[PDB]
Design a protein around this ligand. Structure first.
Ligand SMILES: [Cl-]
Length: 122
């Protein structure tokens, strides 16, 4: 608990795993639930602002089985509860990301990852 961890507008949520998220836009559509194949647009940045991945730049949304272990842990946790049309900012500590290994030649070891995710379909 505590006040300061809830952010400048009292809108930052911290979960038991240490994931943080903030709903930038609350969707009006159906809720994302574990087991659904959801489709999203996203961008990811390192904490220095460097973009490392974006579906928008490929002009192709990304579909995955939510909760299915097919993405980093912070995504499987953080996309749940979004509603279609929503935009959520995920701040993913490295144990819920790529850990000590990093990834792809573009995410260093022990990196916190920032994503903005738009939920398109469930
Ligand atoms: Cl933070």
């Amino acid at each position: 608990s505590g006040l300061v961890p809830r952010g400048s507008h009292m809108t930052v949520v911290t979960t038991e795993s240490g994931l943080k998220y903030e709903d930038l836009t609350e969707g009006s559509g159906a809720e994302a639930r574990a087991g659904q194949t959801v489709s999203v647009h996203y961008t990811g940045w390192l904490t220095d602002g460097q973009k490392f991945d974006s579906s928008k730049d490929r002009n192709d949304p990304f579909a995955f089985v939510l909760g299915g272990g097919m993405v980093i842990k912070g995504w499987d946790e953080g996309v749940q509860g979004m509603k279609v049309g929503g935009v959520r900012r995920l701040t993913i500590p490295p144990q819920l990301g790529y850990g000590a290994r990093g990834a792809g030649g573009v995410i260093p070891p022990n990196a916190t990852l920032v994503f903005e995710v738009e939920l398109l379909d469930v």
